[PDB]
Amino acid sequence: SKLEAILSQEVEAEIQALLQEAEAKAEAVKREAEEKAKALLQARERALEAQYRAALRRAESA
Amino acid sequence: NEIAAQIARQATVRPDLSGEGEKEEPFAVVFAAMGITQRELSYFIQEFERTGALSRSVLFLNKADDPTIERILTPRMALTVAEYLAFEHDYHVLVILTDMTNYCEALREIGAAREEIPGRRGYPGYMYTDLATIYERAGVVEGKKGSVTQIPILSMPDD
DSSP: OHHHHHHHHHHHHHHHHHHHHHHHHHHHHHHHHHHHHTTHHHHHHHHHHHHHHHHHHHHHHO | OHHHHHHHHHOOOOHHHHTSOOOOOOOOEEEEOSSBOSHHHHHHHHHHHHHTOTTTEEEEOOBTTSOTTTTTTHHHHHHHHHHHHHHSSOOEEEEEEOOHHHHHHHHHHHHHTTTOOBSSTTOBTTHHHHHHHHHTSOBOOSSOOOEEEEEEOOOOTTO
């Protein structure tokens, strides 16, 4: 029937909105985890490089 | 002591904002210490060897159990070396004069051994002149590249 198909289309629209919101939030989660793997890979690399440099400065001073 | 060691390890002139070009001339350090116990001395020499400064510094150490009259000669022979290195070899000497209150109580001892009339609270009347003859031996002269900058440390008794 007509309103039968209308209610079925409303259920399909709810499922569509649910899956689109799931895609958006999963993309945001993997994005922020990618930036935290990023910028953490920045911070510890710069810290260890500076530790290596300070060790070389102290060795040549000694 | 941590603030004096932090200043000693990160004081740099800014040549680019000043407009005198750029060379980055680092600091020679003259460290006079009068009654450092063992903990302050351990902190200062570990800080200096960790930042790599004992090849640029000269230390006139006077521990807490050493005799309490050579404290009179300790700052004067520190600043003799400082005036020499700044005004006849053109360094940029920074002078850390630790714990001047021990120097002042040493001169109170030698000025109360001689029955001399005191100023305020038993310290003798010429303590202004002694502290002046130590402090005022710093600054910059004309036409010469050197400088003696002074950071003393005082322990205020009743703060």
